[PDB]
Amino acid sequence: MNIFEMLRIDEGLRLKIYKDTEGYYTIGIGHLLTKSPSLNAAKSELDKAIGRNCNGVITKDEAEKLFNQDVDAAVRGILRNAKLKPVYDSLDAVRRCALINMVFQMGETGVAGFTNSLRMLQEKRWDEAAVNLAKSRWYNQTPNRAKRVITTFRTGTWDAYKNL
């Protein structure tokens, strides 16, 4: 299992514009297009992103291309972030995947806001951090996906996904 497979399980693949859990316009493998209510604003962002007139629809290849960009950007974002980098550097390979997942879903800024959980992870207090992470809007809104991520941080294994 790797970050790509992990995220492909959590986000799904959709070739037509769709609304995410938060009601935002998305396409592909969790690629947010706009927080704007206009489908037209969405279709415009999409064409800009692909470089063609897509008319709200893309190919598998296009979705994967966006996906590669997003994971790359997520990684680079963590490495450039003063709050995130140190945590990342302190973690083992599987747990690193878990932080990437959170950043991909919630953005750098959002994850950087989990001050206490970050501190616990850095200190390798697995059980404590799992409990703290669950006290969030994130967990209440997308509980199955959050539990998967949380178990990943808790155990350092891919058990939560070996099911799926």
Contact by Cβ (8 Å): 52, 18: no
- For 1-164, the fitting CATH number among 2.102.10.10, 3.90.870.10, 1.10.530.40, 2.70.180.20 is 1.10.530.40
132 is in an annotated binding site: yes
- Find, among 163, 129, 161, the residue nearest to 1 by Cα: 161
To one decimal, the resolution in angstroms is 1.8
* Set 20, 47, 64, 128: catalytic member: 20
Residue for token digits 């690629």?
31
- Find, among 132, 143, 144, 125, the residue nearest to 87 by Cα: 125
Write down the experimental method used for this entry.
X-ray
CA angle 46, 71, 43 (to 5 degrees): 5
Bridge partners (DSSP) of residue 25 are 19, 34
**Burial environment of residue 164 by CB neighbours within 10 A (0 to 12, 13 to 18, 19 or more):** exposed
Number of C-beta neighbours around residue 21 at 10 A: 10
38 is in an annotated binding site: no
Has 92 been annotated as catalytic? Answer: no
User: In angstroms, what CA-CA distances link 6 with 41, 50, 53, 97?
Assistant: 30, 24, 30, 8
- Find, among 76, 104, 109, the residue nearest to 3 by Cα: 104
- Show Cβ contacts of residue 66 under 8 Å, excluding neighbours closer than 6 positions: 27, 28, 29, 31, 49, 50, 58
* Set 5, 10, 11, 45: catalytic member: 11
DSSP string, the chain: --HHHHHHHHH--EEEEEE-TTS-EEEETTEEEESSS-HHHHHHHHHHHHTS--TTB--HHHHHHHHHHHHHHHHHHHHH-TTTHHHHHHS-HHHHHHHHHHHHHHHHHHHHT-HHHHHHHHTT-HHHHHHHHTSSHHHHHSHHHHHHHHHHHHHSSSGGGS--
- Find, among 90, 85, 110, the residue nearest to 156 by Cα: 90
The C-alpha atoms of residue 33 and residue 43 are separated, in whole angstroms, by: 8
The C-alpha atoms of residue 4 and residue 128 are separated, in whole angstroms, by: 27
Has 123 been annotated as catalytic? Answer: no
The C-alpha atoms of residue 60 and residue 14 are separated, in whole angstroms, by: 9
Domain segments of the chain as ranges: 1-164
Contact by Cβ (8 Å): 133, 146: yes
117 is in an annotated binding site: yes
